[PDB]
């Protein structure tokens with residue numbers, strides 16, 4: 001039950017999309033641009 005949401009539902013999601021290009025989710029200023037998902041990977045080691 002939102003008051004008047006124009007865009008997409010969420011709390012402290014952000015206005016700009018995730019820094020990454022191949023990412024549908026949105027990004028955040030706290031995650032240095034990246035989104036919740038990426039933000040995690042950023043720290044964790046990636047392979048392939």
Ligand SMILES: [Zn+2]
Pocket residue numbers: 018019020023025026034035036037038039
């Ligand atoms: Zn992302």
